[PDB]
């Protein structure tokens, strides 16, 4: 079935001590949260650059790891019920703020933690290229040869396209019908390796270290061993959802190449550019992509989406 | 009287030839803004770097200037009435299209223009150090001494903290009462120079160059010299306003350490920590506080502010 | 069905600023010819070197990158209708032109815009290396596993043999029918990626910038932001058509040492080598070998070609 | 049907002299033990480094072998009956120790050489990249696409989890029952090409160059071309088999991230996370995991192990 998505963001020093931290403490974290039985997998993303649409964005590029001063993360957590999510930092709390935090020396801005429904998906399992005589094997063993799927290599070996989209209010049917036809014909495109709409339900006050007065100070006097009140979060989930609504279409590719050609063509082939039209028709704000590297990750979660 | 702020921001590379933009390009986009009577001053700032709070931002200084790989922009224009920066931006898109899009190829993310009303100000008129000794002599032959203010010295010769604030909705009422209560209490603070409160009213489609379709390509496809269609801007001001509420609580201060300490008064000082406290608890995000250089302004838009 | 193509050609100056511009330019010049319903795609090449056929271009290698001052490129756009090319020129005049002319800072000879017809293809479509399998998997479940291609990566990841060849008048029957039986006996050649024959029709003049008298003026004299007069053309694309009659042979391999031994079949296989000494003797020019990298394309050309 | 493994250990000083000599005398011992009908095969390592689960073990990391002073080797030879490596030892001892004995020079510690059973395979045949299309065709014309193997590469092109477990007293058939269970849920991680489990059974004496006091004092006097008493070993195989019970989890992976993760399934994904649980209540000791490079192999083993 479709899980619940929670991403944590924050952006942080780019220097080895954040990537060394990111070494011990991350797995340290993701068995924490394996605590719970409604965890059902992870994808963590370090922001590798932005696609700069021409010279729209003339100052990006897709790599700028080389000369950026700052490292955006985006951990994907994938739940069966999004409730799961705030029950497992509560359940869990002494572990995950005292982990969480001590990556604070290294913190610029965050950490935030909306959460998502997934609307749309068409994902692939994940498979190393050593997999695919199995997979294929398997497959018209049991008659299903139109299940084999794309080659999606985990573990940093494929990058990411995040489009960032926010919509007008009382547009969000149009663009979502839109959107879903766009990428049923994107899928099209050389070194397409799936996407997912995913659609802002709200945010996770404990998980974006965003508490009440007590809580906020907890934070700011914190040894580093003492944990905030996590009953003092003052907001539900979806009492912070946005408006107007945001929505992240996440399309995975097989290089960066791919990404920026694949991605094109809703822009360079007419027929996808009339469809695609419809969706820029709605939005606010976007479409804003950043480019991402799927590093670290349970890739089991593809499992349970596609059961 | 309070004058609508809108709130030009931008992230363009680190780097001289965005410097060298910044000053010939910025100099003409304001004085084509100044050909509409609705304008009342401007106050541009780069950002320089991160309040850390203590260690809760470990990453962050407030100079982060020679480390950064980007540059922030934060461009204050002031009017009387919001629809006359609409009008400004739609009378004069010619100039204004061509000169803002020249600053593609150094732009990372931007721009994005958030519109403000101001719902509480306790600004003075800038005065350089040459200045007080005049200022001094004509509020006591006017026979207001009260009227004297601190001395605010122009063109990057003070800085800035912007604390962004979003609040849970339902929670406005006391969010604003206690942020005056804070602020009013606040201007003992050493080195004080001013402080306002920013308050979300929407987002102006055209300055953030957020279009339908049809002008999304002719941004995405322009040489420089042709226009996007100024028609094609698919929502008014108040459809993009954010729900959660989104406040700026601007502070000016007479150094980075008058700030430091200074904003820190609302921790440190007990009578002062309680009542920012019903501040903190109304929050769905922040605080979280840019530091910022007023490098290029027109400082007669306090004299507006204050008749 | 099989499309037109049209091919810009140019000589620029082999410096990082040119390639910079093919990266922010080149994007907006293929967005804005996509505004046209008859446009199916592009794939655009630059030079790399030049097939030596032994020493008979002792001077010359197949990958000259790292020694040459300038850089050849032939930009592929595919048409449903060569008049469609045409049209879509004048129709957005204003953007082309001024994006097209921007080129000019580094420009040594051109453009130049034969176009052509396709009077023989074999091409696939192209494929990453990951989409192989669901592509395998697919063509078995419709029963058409002799559907299954051989792998032709996008995006720089193959190259191209641009053999140009003149014919004597008199003689193209011979030539098309002879060529036709050689690629048809070529592509069991290791690495063979396919192969198309393309057969002048004409030369676009406004495409090559070629006007009268008033238009060249305005092109001299440009500041880069007036259109010279595009109905200032003297010659329609077929008055331009050259005799003798000019075609390009266009075979793709996977790797330059596939397509250095397998164009060599022509001339190391005796039953082929008979076969093409029949294209032999029908030249006036040729066969002269370019070796090209597809490194910018719209892969979805093969499928209009292919349905 | 499944052999016994005899693995000798040893510690020797990194250094390119002792690769020197794995190089020379390394397929001489393969090829004396080759000489004996019950030898069914052999698989080589060097250990590259040690799994830092997180950071419990933070001065290790995956790959040490850019830093480590030593070398470990673990030399496993494949046997249809554990009897035929002690008799293989014996009939060509005059070879074999002097062989073995030349690698004293470089020796720290060893060499030890416990004897095994394997009480679960999931080992597939190696194959390389080249082989998989041939490997395919004739699975499908026997009717088996279900035996067709991941590509488990031969010669260095894989990696291996090593991970020494030893359990408490009356506690194996527990441990036997859920590591199976384990391991059978594992091999559904990406890159997982196989896992085997190994149960100690005894040590060899005559491989571990332990004697009584008269060959003792032979080994210690040797100028390199004297024999030690075989028969003054003092102890039969299962006389030093150990209690705790000691067992290795063998487990292959495409890579070592490939390796990180999918060992690491067994403590992310909660249903795997519940089953091996029951492997962790069972433990005295572990689990340590070795990371090793097979990289000198006799890949017939698993022929015989698969049939
Ligand atoms: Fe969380
Ligand atoms: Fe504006
Ligand atoms: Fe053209
Ligand atoms: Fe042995």
């Known amino acids: 079935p479709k899980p619940y998505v929670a991403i944590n ?14 070494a011990s403490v991350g797995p340290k974290v993701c068995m924490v949260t394996a ?7 992870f994808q963590n993303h370090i922001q590798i650059g932005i696609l700069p649409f021409g010279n729209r964005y003339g100052g990006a590029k897709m790599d700028m790891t080389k000369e950026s001063s700052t490292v955006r993360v985006l951990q994907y957590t994938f739940w069966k019920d999004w409730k799961d999510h705030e029950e497992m930092h509560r359940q869990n709390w002494s572990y995950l703020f005292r982990l969480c935090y001590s990556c604070a ?6 950490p935030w933690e909306p959460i998502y429904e997934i609307i749309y998906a068409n994902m692939p399992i994940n498979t190393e290229m050593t997999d695919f005589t199995a997979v294929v094997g398997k497959k018209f063993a049991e008659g299903k040869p139109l299940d084999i799927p794309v080659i ?5 070996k494929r990058v990411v396209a995040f489009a960032e989209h926010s919509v007008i209010p009382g547009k969000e049917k149009q663009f979502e019908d839109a959107i879903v036809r766009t990428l049923e014909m994107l899928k099209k495109a050389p070194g397409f390796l799936g996407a997912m709409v995913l659609k802002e339900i709200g945010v996770s006050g404990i998980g974006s270290m965003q508490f009440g007065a007590k809580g906020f100070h907890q934070v700011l006097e914190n040894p580093g061993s003492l944990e ?3 009953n003092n979060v003052m907001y539900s989930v979806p009492e912070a959802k946005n408006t107007p609504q945001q929505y992240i279409v996440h399309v995975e590719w097989a290089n960066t ?4 050609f694949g991605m094109g063509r809703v822009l360079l082939y007419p ?4 469809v695609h039209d419809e969706v820029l028709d709605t939005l606010v704000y976007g479409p ?3 480019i991402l590297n799927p590093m670290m990750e349970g890739t089991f979660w593809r499992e349970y989406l596609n059961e």
């Open 9 to 22: 963001m924050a952006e942080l020093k780019n220097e080895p001590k954040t990537f060394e931290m990111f």
């Open 35 to 41: 605590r719970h039985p409604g965890f059902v997998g």
């Open 105 to 110: 020396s290294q913190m610029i801005w965050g």
């Open 152 to 156: 999606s290599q985990p573990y940093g």
């Open 228 to 230: 905030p009140d996590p």
């Open 257 to 260: 190449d791919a990404l920026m």
């Open 271 to 274: 027929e996808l550019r009339q």
């Open 288 to 290: 804003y992509i950043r």
